[PDB]
Design a protein around this ligand. Sequence first.
Ligand code: HEA
Ligand code: HEA
Ligand SMILES: CCCCC/C=C\C/C=C/C/C=C\C/C=C\CCCC(=O)O[C@H](COC(=O)CCCCCCCCCCCCCCCCC)COP(=O)(O)OCCN
Ligand SMILES: CCCCCC/C=C\CCCCCCCCCC(=O)O[C@H](COC(=O)CCCCCCCCCCCCCCC)COP(=O)(O)OC[C@@H](O)CO
Ligand SMILES: CCCCCCCCCCO[C@@H]1O[C@H](CO)[C@@H](O[C@H]2O[C@H](CO)[C@@H](O)[C@H](O)[C@H]2O)[C@H](O)[C@H]1O
Ligand SMILES: CCCCCCCCCCO[C@@H]1O[C@H](CO)[C@@H](O[C@H]2O[C@H](CO)[C@@H](O)[C@H](O)[C@H]2O)[C@H](O)[C@H]1O
Ligand SMILES: C[C@H](CCC(=O)O)[C@H]1CC[C@H]2[C@@H]3[C@H](O)C[C@@H]4C[C@H](O)CC[C@]4(C)[C@H]3C[C@H](O)[C@]12C
Ligand code: NA
Lengths: 258, 40, 56, 72, 143, 513, 49, 227, 44
Amino acid sequence: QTHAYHMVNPSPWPLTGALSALLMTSGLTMWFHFNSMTLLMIGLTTNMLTMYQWWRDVIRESTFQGHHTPAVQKGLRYGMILFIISEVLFFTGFFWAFYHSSLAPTPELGGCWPPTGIHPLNPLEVPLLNTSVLLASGVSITWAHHSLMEGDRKHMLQALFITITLGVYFTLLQASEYYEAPFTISDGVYGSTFFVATGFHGLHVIIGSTFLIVCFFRQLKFHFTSNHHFGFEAAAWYWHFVDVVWLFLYVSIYWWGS
Amino acid sequence: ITAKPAKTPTSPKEQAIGLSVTFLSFLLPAGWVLYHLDNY
Amino acid sequence: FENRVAEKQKLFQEDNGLPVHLKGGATDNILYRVTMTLCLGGTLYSLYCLGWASFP
Amino acid sequence: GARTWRFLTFGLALPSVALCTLNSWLHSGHRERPAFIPYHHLRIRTKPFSWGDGNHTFFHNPRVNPLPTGYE
Amino acid sequence: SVVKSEDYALPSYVDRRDYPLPDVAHVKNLSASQKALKEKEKASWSSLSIDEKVELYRLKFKESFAEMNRSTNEWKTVVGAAMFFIGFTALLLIWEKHYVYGPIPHTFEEEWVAKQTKRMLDMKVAPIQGFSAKWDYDKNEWK
Amino acid sequence: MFINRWLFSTNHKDIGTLYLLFGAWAGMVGTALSLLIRAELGQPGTLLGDDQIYNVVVTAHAFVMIFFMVMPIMIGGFGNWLVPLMIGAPDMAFPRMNNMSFWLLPPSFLLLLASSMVEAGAGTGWTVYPPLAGNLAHAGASVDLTIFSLHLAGVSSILGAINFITTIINMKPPAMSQYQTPLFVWSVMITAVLLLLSLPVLAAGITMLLTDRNLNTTFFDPAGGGDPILYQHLFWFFGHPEVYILILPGFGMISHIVTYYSGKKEPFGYMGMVWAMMSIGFLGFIVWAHHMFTVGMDVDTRAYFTSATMIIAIPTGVKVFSWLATLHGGNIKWSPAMMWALGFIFLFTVGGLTGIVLANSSLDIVLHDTYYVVAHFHYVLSMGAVFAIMGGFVHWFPLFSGYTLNDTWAKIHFAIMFVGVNMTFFPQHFLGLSGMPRRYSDYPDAYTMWNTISSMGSFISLTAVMLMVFIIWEAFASKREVLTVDLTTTNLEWLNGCPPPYHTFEEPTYVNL
Amino acid sequence: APDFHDKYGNAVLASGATFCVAVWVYMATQIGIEWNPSPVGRVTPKEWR
Amino acid sequence: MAYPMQLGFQDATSPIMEELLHFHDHTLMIVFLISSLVLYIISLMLTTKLTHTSTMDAQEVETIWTILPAIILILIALPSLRILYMMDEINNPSLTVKTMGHQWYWSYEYTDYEDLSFDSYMIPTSELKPGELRLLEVDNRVVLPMEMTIRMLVSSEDVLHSWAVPSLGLKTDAIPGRLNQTTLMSSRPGLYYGQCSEICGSNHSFMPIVLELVPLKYFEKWSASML
Amino acid sequence: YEEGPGKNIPFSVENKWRLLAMMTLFFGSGFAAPFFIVRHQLLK
Ligand code: HEA
Ligand code: HEA
Ligand SMILES: CCCCC/C=C\C/C=C/C/C=C\C/C=C\CCCC(=O)O[C@H](COC(=O)CCCCCCCCCCCCCCCCC)COP(=O)(O)OCCN
Ligand SMILES: CCCCCC/C=C\CCCCCCCCCC(=O)O[C@H](COC(=O)CCCCCCCCCCCCCCC)COP(=O)(O)OC[C@@H](O)CO
Ligand SMILES: CCCCCCCCCCO[C@@H]1O[C@H](CO)[C@@H](O[C@H]2O[C@H](CO)[C@@H](O)[C@H](O)[C@H]2O)[C@H](O)[C@H]1O
Ligand SMILES: CCCCCCCCCCO[C@@H]1O[C@H](CO)[C@@H](O[C@H]2O[C@H](CO)[C@@H](O)[C@H](O)[C@H]2O)[C@H](O)[C@H]1O
Ligand SMILES: C[C@H](CCC(=O)O)[C@H]1CC[C@H]2[C@@H]3[C@H](O)C[C@@H]4C[C@H](O)CC[C@]4(C)[C@H]3C[C@H](O)[C@]12C
Ligand code: NA
């Protein structure tokens, strides 16, 4: 070849991924309707195996084999940006549901928001702490990025460790707030909007935290150069996305919706 | 477009067989179901 | 820790015709066999479940 | 530079988290739960949940989450 | 002039009325007599016979404009075959009527339709244009 | 070697071939469902004696035609085969993720056929509106299996959209601007942007329906303060973009076919064609509530959605007139693909014009949920998408296969299909104007004549489908190998021969500034 | 040299047209299809009450 | 109701339906002309051996084929919106009637004065009286006063339905938890038929609507006799 | 991998009669499926 693009070795992971999607969806069906978790647990397992092997192979292709030319890295930049846009439009649907319900509360609710019998969380207590935590993690990840660009291994690791610790603190605080909440997902459209929107956000925080932990171990193993570290860039972009979604949830559901 | 003559020419008789088999593959199973609807 | 990236570069560039998903050695083959066995076995089980669920 | 972002991390961001941790800490402790009222727009049960006895939410807290029939 | 699959990247011959002078000659290889004819072509064309002039044309080109532009009888095959397969479709519809469809409802019986028609006229269904408009209430018949 | 090649592919051509095979199989399923619909309606009374089953057949017909026939063929099949070739790229940006977009579709289809086999099926309409689609009126697994089918199809198309946008932006020759890419490539990029933005909103909405059915949420349940109308907004915010997604790659193929068989080097008004597709894509996001003119929305909202909808006719008209201006002065080759394209221009125009009638909310009150809507979308969507697919298939079959079709058989096929679809759908306009509802298993006796004719038309199109399978068999049976293709100087996809080698553009094109 | 269309086109057009008309006329008129045309100018209304 | 071999709309029973017929006539003339012009231009482009295959300048002609369509859309939109705003305009109803959709029948409530309500089911085909219409008759018709402005309020007690009467220009979705308003005014006595117009499950085809329009005095006595 | 006409496909075109059988089964199974699903639902 005399172009700069990557001809990928034939791979089984697309098929194992597609089959893991069949097993997770048929498994959710089997759990919701036939009182059984077996297919779902097989699907989750094959999904995790597929993700591990596929992204392992991308590291092999890039760090170990050198296939990530500038042209290839440019494509991955576009891919990650487009993926994030699709996730923004997914959350947009949940915000639309929330505004639809809260701006025109029906008679079943008492014709008010919050509904009769709903006691919202105080947005100045744990929700404000969660806001400080994710904003702080946006600062620490920026420190990590500049440390890596400046060639500073120790400070990159310290900054990224702080960022991960804050993501874990957010997750533990949210878990505690779920347990302590006096309302549930079954508490009408208030509970529905609150838990589905914050729940998908929580899942994205766990995914982003996992991505940062992958970057932490890759950094420990010297994979990143001061100029070439797209996995870290992508993890940082994703983490900023999770921050921004939180700020919109905080203002919309916790504060304005209280 | 230009093309070579057929490597394995399909005569009029061969075409009638292929067309007949193709039509029967669509018509017989559906026909069996629709004929037996009353029974179902 | 020490930087052992050069040793992994040599391993994954070896001229042995292996595709990248197997080029780490025998552990890759085992993890592949486990993954594909669970996927194909799970898929056959999902078809059995459809057969069961298709009748009252 | 890295030096400036570390300065912001330790000098503004983590102090903010410590202050909000203090604020949350001070306002912790259980509030008195409200009288149970079996409102029809709450404690929705259109299908049993796929775990437990079908009537408990996933992160059910007996202290603050009444069932459709009231507190446990 | 045998054209080969392995030739796809080379300049090729076409007969197209919008591309009258193609990129290559129809005939690239010349016999002894064809070589002599190409040497004769370097002298006065008045000295070429009609046969030599045609042979020069057929070395350069495959089909003439008249040949490449000719009309065909293909339309007869296409229209006839289409009408055959549309006729075959009516066999399928006969089969469906005989073996799949049972009786239609009793509301299509002649006497039902005669009574229903009167009732539609009594309720003045579409009295401006569509239906009762076409009945003469004075003469008790269709206009 | 077979498993490595066909199950583990990282090759844009072989993946495109998998999509074309999948879409052709899906089209046979969707056609059988359509014939069951028309058999139920072909005489007054009941055929199946089970209107739940009728409703399941109608629902499945739409999902199969849209998600398993048109999108896989246009985007997965033509897009994968042609886009890299038309920009001189060596493959897609993400050649391994591309294979997962493909392999998600067999499981998606399996979930849909599971939905029809368990309980009493999902007899919801392809809209899946609650509360009919909820856990009371559709208790049991069928609707959940339908939702999960849509989740997997959605992931397939979102990842494919990321692939196409990245490929088209990043993998052109460095000298080639976006304004030197062919119109088919534009049509795929714009379709991909619509997919990227619309499918996540569908995903959110059907996920809400899933939680309403299984986790005691009440997004759409007024008992909890929810609203069935919210589902309709989320669905149609996706669903109007989706109808443009279904036609845009067809517009791209029509531009190429009309150019080619007119003997032209280029389509008329290239930048107007780009402008028109981007304008249709944009306007396609601001019109959705024309699917909701009878739900009780405010008069000023109706006036806005009427007006915004009608604007789409302006860019669309530029494309129709530009196709006519491409024919103008052509050395017309009356190939079967040209006939498909000419049929497309006319039938698409008729359906687009009945769309403009429907855009008028006052008239839509009387036409909504009638056969007039069914007639509109079987013209623009059903015939427009199918005619563009058949045109593209007969035009590019010799590129993909290396073999030629019998042109006389292909012209016979076209002629039968043209008669069948017009006999089937033209009378549905009369049924709609005269008030016959859609999604009915039987009709008042007055509607018998047009239903009878419609159902007879359906059988003529069946004869065309059976002949198409024979015509493909006869091409592979006879093995007439391609020699020369005209106009390669303005059709790069042909310049590597028929079929092109597994790896093309290993050495990229040379394009200077 | 005469092709398929020169040899058979006349016969294909004549036979296809004849067959198509004959079978559609038989299907439309001889097998009990109820077309339910307009009663206007056709049906004598009859007392129903 | 529709009649056999019908091509167009049912004859107008209400002034708004009259308006919709004249608007449809105007719009259909435009659809015919544009369809016909495209087919004619196709045929014109395809019927000459004369050729011009060099690059053609687009900008002058693109002005015509944007401006002329814009003018045509304005000529459709103006009368379209005039009718939209006429239907919406304040008419002062004399009577309010509610209809509730159910799987699979309509209920009606006339509660301005007394508690009048009843259920309205399709007449089974096997029970039709001679001359009656298959799939269209009901046991209990919606009796209403003719030549009077009536407010219809539409809702549902289960899934979505849609309350339609084509000859009066009416179609209003029936949504649980929502009370949708429309206005009805018949210029004539008689029987006016419609059919459920949102898929509501297995008997969607079999829950019709029959309005019976009579003088006020007959409506008042019918109302009293239905308590 | 094999290149060229009849080799860039996951099915064999070596024998036109085996191909007819394969295409019959392929397209026929898709067209038949909805009839057999209707039969299945009727028989419950
Ligand atoms: C290929 C798919 C496709 C395409 C491209 C379109 C294109 C259009 N559609 Fe259609 N539509 C559907 C598929 C499609 N639609 C489907 C599937 C449904 C039903 C969904 C369901 O309910 O299941 C539907 C339903 C639908 C409705 C809802 C009706 C109802 O349910 O009551 C409306 C309302 O306005 C609408 C309008 C339009 C308009 C104005 C266009 C415009 O984009 C058309 C523009 C084109 C032209 C106008 C023709 C060419 C132009 C000229 C020659 C220029 C000159 C013209 C003028 C000046 C007018 N369509
Ligand atoms: C792309 C979309 C598409 C296509 C192609 C079709 C094709 C057909 N459809 Fe329709 N249909 C819909 C989308 C489509 N449909 C939708 C969205 C609905 C609404 C569902 C609902 O209400 O919820 C619907 C509803 C619908 C109804 C209304 C049902 C009701 O309201 O109760 C009817 C009635 O006659 C009908 C008939 C047909 C017929 C006879 C065909 C065809 O038989 C016409 C002929 C076309 C073909 C036979 C296709 C051929 C193509 C292939 C075989 C692919 C070949 C592949 C390659 C060459 C690679 N369909
Ligand atoms: C620390 C927070 C992080 C979240 C992790 C916790 C839970 C599992 C995963 C969460 C994923 C996110 C959202 C899924 C929907 C619902 C969960 C919402 C968050 C949550 O956890 O909600 C809980 C309910 O969980 C329930 O029902 C449990 C439901 C469990 C099964 C979920 C069903 C999966 C849904 C399918 C997903 C579809 C994805 C589509 C992708 C798009 C493709 C195009 C709240 O508990 P509660 O007792 O009601 O109230 C508290 C009272 N003290
Ligand atoms: C408990 C929850 C369970 C749910 C399952 C999901 C859970 C966790 C998933 C976490 C994501 C981890 C992703 C790890 C990616 C590792 C590979 C990587 O980062 O690869 C990099 C390329 O990036 C690339 O492919 C970029 C790859 C981007 C991928 C990430 C996108 C997020 C994934 C979301 C998954 C589903 C979410 C949907 C939710 C509805 C490699 O290039 P460099 O870094 O430049 O290195 C090269 C240099 O060494 C040369 O000098
Ligand atoms: C929408 C797609 C369908 C279009 C219509 C299909 C056209 C008909 C194809 C023929 O189908 C066959 O018809 C036979 C009858 O003619 C059936 O035999 C049935 O009837 C015979 C005669 O009574 C018996 O001898 C057989 O046992 C019995 O199965 C047979 O089963 C069925 O396969
Ligand atoms: C790599 C190969 C892939 C692995 C394939 C795994 C196949 C084996 C699955 C075991 O099957 C299980 O059998 C149980 C019955 O014995 C079911 O119990 C469930 O159904 C019971 C019915 O008795 C109930 O008690 C409960 O709901 C529950 O225990 C359960 O659903 C089901 O999954
Ligand atoms: C000693 C070691 C050196 C790393 C190296 O050069 O290989 C240091 C450098 C950065 C350190 C990490 C970071 O300083 C941040 C964390 C600090 C905690 O106190 C221990 C874990 C923690 C995650 C550290 C683990 C370990 O001690 C690291 C990795
Ligand atoms: Na019927």
